[PDB]
Amino acid sequence: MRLRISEAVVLFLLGAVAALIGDHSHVVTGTTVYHTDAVPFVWSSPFWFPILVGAATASLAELRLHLPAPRDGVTARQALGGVAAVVGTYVTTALVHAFPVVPVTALVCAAAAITWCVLGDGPGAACGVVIAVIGPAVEIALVQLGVFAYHPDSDGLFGVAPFLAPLYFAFGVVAALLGELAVARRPQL
Amino acid sequence: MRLRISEAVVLFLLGAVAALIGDHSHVVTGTTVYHTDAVPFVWSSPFWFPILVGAATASLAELRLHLPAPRDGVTARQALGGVAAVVGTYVTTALVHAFPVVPVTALVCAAAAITWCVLGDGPGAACGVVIAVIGPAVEIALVQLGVFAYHPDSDGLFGVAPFLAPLYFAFGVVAALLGELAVARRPQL
Amino acid sequence: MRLRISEAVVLFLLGAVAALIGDHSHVVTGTTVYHTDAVPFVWSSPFWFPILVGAATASLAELRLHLPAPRDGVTARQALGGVAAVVGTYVTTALVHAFPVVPVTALVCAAAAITWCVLGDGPGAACGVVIAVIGPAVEIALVQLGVFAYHPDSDGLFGVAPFLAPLYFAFGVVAALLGELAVARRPQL
Numbered sequence A, B, C: 001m002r003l004r005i006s007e008a009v010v011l012f013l014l015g016a017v018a019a020l021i022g023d024h025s026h027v028v029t030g031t032t033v034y035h036t037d038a039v040p041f042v043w044s045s046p047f048w049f050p051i052l053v054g055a056a057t058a059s060l061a062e063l064r065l066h067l068p069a070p071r072d073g074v075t076a077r078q079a080l081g082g083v084a085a086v087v088g089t090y091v092t093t094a095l096v097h098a099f100p101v102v103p104v105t106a107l108v109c110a111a112a113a114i115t116w117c118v119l120g121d122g123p124g125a126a127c128g129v130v131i132a133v134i135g136p137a138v139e140i141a142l143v144q145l146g147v148f149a150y151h152p153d154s155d156g157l158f159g160v161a162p163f164l165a166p167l168y169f170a171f172g173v174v175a176a177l178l179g180e181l182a183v184a185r186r187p188q189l
Ligand SMILES: CCCCCCCCCCCCCC(=O)O[C@@H](CO)COC(=O)CCCCCCCCCCCCBr
Pocket: A014, A015, A018, A019, A022, A023, A026, A031, A032, A049, A052, A053, A055, A056, A057, A059, A082, A083, A086, A087, A090, A134, A135, A136, A138, A139, A142, A148, A149, A167, A168, A171, A174, A175
């Protein structure tokens, strides 16, 4: 792998912590409800939820490093900005989930687009597309399995929120950037 | 004209589509209600609404190209970012229209200002001023004519929402940028 | 002092006006209620509130100029952008104050972080930390004294809103930038 172990671990933990904050926001606003109770929870989430997102974070960062021309100019400042953007957008979906689907989804698309405009490149966008498909698909399957459910005003995409698509896209863009940063910030001559 | 026909057509369509999304958001949140019913509607809007905004988009882009020193460094990335900002702000007004007028209007002014800070120049700002006057004036006239109405908590500017002023301003700034892009993206040596 | 008197006065007034807008937003949304009535009010605020914030604005700008390496490239465009960001974030706290504390506080942290990412440096961040401690501490004392109170869904930090911490932080970052601008914009050869 191109990531060092320690790097993948930090990325995993960063993904996990951000996921717990965002998922807690969804639960406490009634954006989503879990139905699973036999599993251990971490905060408001089943233990495997932060593992999945943390794994996805390190995985997408790794993936970027196998795509052409990882950018060596990427900075901690840019990375902090992208994480903030993704977290900000995530918690915003909790706050507006009960509003009509068009302005809500459009708002999140706007945030995702601006995030890419400021920070993303072609391969970054590609990583975003990959998770923008896989993320919602996994959630649809879990909802279909009765593991959790979305609020009725927030379930238009086969039982899950349409905002998940631009939300995951922005996530993929930033995770890619994070992988670029992991290399770029290594000690230099 | 400085725009090519094909360019003006794309700008017109971009304006029209964004307008339909934003106007639908206003209707479905109860920000506005139409009273006209004898005209054909496109989605939630009278057919002439997207024509007006699309026309205004191409027109403002054209106008910029007659103002001093159109910037040749303008990119698709910048343009996508500005459109996202304008659409994001537009749908946000639908979401917050029922809140008190001061924080709502201030929020939209903030978005408009930041949009200009990131993307606009002097002539861009001038295009913004032009539509920030004309836009709301046209709406005031239409409301006065009983064509549509704003929500009572959102009609303080002679029957229309005070947020229309910074919203149109941001629109004018980005449309100007779009005209700069139309020239800048032409095939080069 | 490094600031000229006229500069400190403009900064003071800018701070005062922005504070009045933000504080009015808090009062009118029920984010906060004043209990003091024997003092003259300016708009929705006791007269000393805008004095305190204006004083804090000029003071933090001054403070930055005693910290290492004030940036001479700082522009009016950057400064307008930062003020807009701080005001936008301020009024947003009024709009979302009744929502659950985690997504609300996280949203404001995100705005503060992005603001620093775009505009701040090390000493700027330090100014932010200084007021992110002092601001909320002063408010806690005033609330303890019964001078005003926060909404029950917005008082988790010893009686004041946890969002005050990232809000003041962003304020400190931008005020620092404003002090840099005051020097940088002086007439040049
Ligand atoms: C090969 C590595 C493992 C691959 C696994 C790829 C799939 C990962 C994602 C889909 C999974 C999560 C399914 C899920 O349970 O989420 C649901 C449960 O109800 C949580 O409910 C929700 O409403 C929240 C949707 C989560 C949105 C995730 C966005 C990621 C942002 C956090 C990272 C920020 C750091 Br750049």
